[PDB]
Amino acid sequence: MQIPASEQETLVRPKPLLLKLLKSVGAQKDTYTMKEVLFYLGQYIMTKRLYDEKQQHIVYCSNDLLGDLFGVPSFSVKEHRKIYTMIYRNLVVV
């Protein structure tokens, strides 16, 4: 896998906007493992149908809160380094 699995176990504290986003799809806590944050971001992208229907590795967010948080108009789910950095922009480590 692109990023070692041990990275998903890191305990993190989402900043206010990201925390609001996570809770809007049913997250229940103030702190998460990175694996949990990824899961809930996945539910958000699904629920708002932001992925390209035919090219499902592309997520569009130029006009969505997700784009505000990530700082991009769209991204590929295949490029994990960028996902890591985009998420960490919105976190502090516990």
Ligand X SMILES: CC(C)(C)NC(=O)[C@@H](c1c(C(=O)O)[nH]c2cc(Cl)ccc12)N(C=O)Cc1ccc(OCc2ccc(Cl)cc2)cc1
Closer to ligand X by Cβ: residue 13 or 51: 51
How far is it, in rounded angstroms, from Cα 54 to Cα 37?
A: 25
- Distance, first Cα to last Cα, the chain: 25
CB of 16 to ligand X, least distance (A): 18
Residues of this chain that bind ligand X (CB under 6 A): 3, 7-8, 34, 38-39, 41-42, 45-46, 51, 56, 59, 77, 80, 83-84
Closer to ligand X by Cβ: residue 22 or 59: 59
- Cα–chain center distance at 30: 15
CB of 70 to ligand X, least distance (A): 8
How far is it, in rounded angstroms, from Cα 25 to Cα 80?
A: 22
The CB-nearest residue to ligand X is 42
CB of 33 to ligand X, least distance (A): 9
| Beta-sheet pairing, 32-33 with 11-14 | antiparallel
- Beta carbons within 10 angstroms of residue 29's beta carbon: 11
Closer to ligand X by Cβ: residue 8 or 31: 8
